[PDB]
Amino acid sequence: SSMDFPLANLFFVPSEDATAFGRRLRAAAQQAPIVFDTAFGMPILLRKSHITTAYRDTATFSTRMFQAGILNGGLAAMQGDEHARMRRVYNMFFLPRAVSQYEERFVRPISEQVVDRLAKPRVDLLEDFAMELPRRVIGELFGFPAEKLHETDERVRAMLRGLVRMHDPAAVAESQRAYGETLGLITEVVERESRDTSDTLLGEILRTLKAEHMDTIEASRQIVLSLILGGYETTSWLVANTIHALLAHPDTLARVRQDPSLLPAAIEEGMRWCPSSFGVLRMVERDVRLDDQALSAGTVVCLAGIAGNYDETAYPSPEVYDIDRKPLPAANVFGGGAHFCVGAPLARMEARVGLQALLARFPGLRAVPEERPSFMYGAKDSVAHGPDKLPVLLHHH
Ligand code: HEM
């Protein structure tokens, strides 16, 4: 629902160049501050000043559109003080100390097992590594088998598609259907790990929720749901895009293999160069003017904060994957303001620890030379921008 905005098609466009997405967004930002994306179904805010303002004025740009779907009752759908309260609690699970504990207890072991398992006939690091690792990690946080989560794949994406394409009745309906079909699993996990007294990081989370007097069936389900949507599906694509960036720049890959301390930068520059999400959705709560542009109350819009990822003035030669950029580029993929991804520290860590294992174990790692991946937003019916595959050779050396 928009007005005088140029039509555009920025998201669902395949390209063999992983930079195409970023460039397109940037190119559109230079033509106009707001466009209407016909495939994505809403006005897209592209100018940094509009976006940074919008992240901070939550009463004008709210997350109330999430109150009408499966995320109702979760953190993202909360507003004002209710959100602040609950965010305080979600924050406790992602503190540096907690995140390191997860690294030693789960993510390092699991990443090593996942990687050794590849030493397989025809390796695709998307399905065999980037999807595998986060799924197994969530498996272990729940005390639940990873193969049972793997069968939720199509449901997890159906759930997510209805959170983005909410202008689409069928996507919304399938999102609800899929949640209902996954409620059993989610409730089971909650019951086992809220049990008498047992031991999963999930158990610790549920005991914390109770200690803070926020223990409800909805809250417990929503946390579990978060861990699935973010810590499994969304994290996968961040790992995939980072890998691709390294494979596509073998000098940089070599440097990183020789000095793993370069990994955090490799990941942050990854998020700039080849971002896995677009930003965020927001509901305009009052008629608002943004320079010459007008938006009506009731319009859902997208803040495409990644349109700055290719601003030459901030990141010269934006097409170039340069892990030496300093300061490191600001991570627009996690959103902004009060709703900024609370799981980021876990996600960044899974990527670091997973990649380090991979590069340690296969010095010979390289892309298969003329099977170029294809990139688009909507890859595999997800809500990520990502490759369709990442075929690799693990030797010579
Ligand atoms: C790794 C586990 C993850 C978990 C458990 C998780 C969880 C969450 C939660 C609960 C929120 C809502 C926070 C709030 O409203 O205050 C959130 C927001 C968000 N997360 Fe994640 N997340 C994860 C990973 C990721 C990854 C890898 C990405 C993107 C690459 C991502 C992108 C986002 C974005 C863009 C938002 C903002 C939505 C908004 O501001 O409206 N997250 N995450």
Expressed in angstroms and rounded, the spacing between residue 357 Cα and the centre of ligand 1 is: 25
Q: Whose CA is nearest to atom 36 of ligand 1?
A: 341
Q: Can you give 119-145 as a three-state secondary structure string? A: CCCCCEHHHHHHCHHHHHHHHHHHCCC
Q: Which of 341, 346, 352, 383 is the pocket-test mutation for ligand 1 (most atoms within 8 Å of CB)?
A: 341
CA of 98 to the centre of ligand 1 (A): 18
DSSP-derived 3-state class of residue 290: strand
Output the CA 232–ligand 1 centroid distance in Å.
11
Q: What is the resolution of this structure in A?
A: 2.7
| Distance from Cα 240 to the centre of ligand 1, integer Å | 17
> Which residue positions form the known binding site?
83, 87, 282, 336, 339, 341
Q: Give CA–CA dist 394/361, Å, rounded.
A: 9
> What is d(CA 143, CA 132) in angstroms, rounded to the nearest whole number?
16
CA of 347, closest atom in ligand 1: 1
Between vectors from CA 156 to CA 138 and to CA 78, what angle results, nearest 5°?
85
CATH numbers and ranges of domains, the chain: 1-397 (1.10.630.10)
CA of 342 to the centre of ligand 1 (A): 6
Q: Say which experimental method was used.
A: X-ray
Q: What is the DSSP string of 71-107?
A: TTTSGGG--HHHHHHHHHHHHHTTSHHHHHHHIIIII
Which atom in ligand 1 lies closest to the alpha carbon of residue 87? 16
Rounded CA-CA distance 116/133 in Å is 12
Measuring from each residue's beta carbon to the nearest atom of ligand 1, which residues come in under 6 Å? 63, 75-76, 87, 90, 226-227, 230-231, 234-235, 238, 276-277, 280, 333-335, 339, 341-343, 346-347
Give the closest residue (by CA) to ligand 1 atom 32: 334
Q: Is 289 helix (H, G, I), strand (E, B) or coil?
A: strand
Distance CA 135, CA 229 (A): 10
Question: Which element (helix H / strand E) includes 175?
Answer: helix 169-193
* CA quadruple 104, 109, 112, 115: dihedral sign: negative
Residues 176, 346: Cα–Cα separation, whole Å? 27
Measured CA distances, 346 to 37, 91, 238, 250 (Å): 32, 11, 12, 27
Which positions ≥6 away from 249 have C-beta within 8 Å?
321
Q: What's the 340 CA to ligand 1 centre distance in angstroms?
A: 7
SS3 337: helix
Question: What's the CA angle centered on 161, arms 154 and 110, to 5 degrees?
Answer: 50
Angle 85-306-242 from CA coordinates, rounded to 5°: 95
For residue 34, list its beta bridge partners: 45
The DSSP-derived string for 191-222 is HHHTSSS---HHHHHHHHHHHTT---HHHHHH
CA–CA gap between residue 236 and residue 357 (Å, rounded): 16
Q: Which tokens is 220 given?
A: 């417990």
| Contact yes or no for 73/214 (Cβ under 8 A) | no
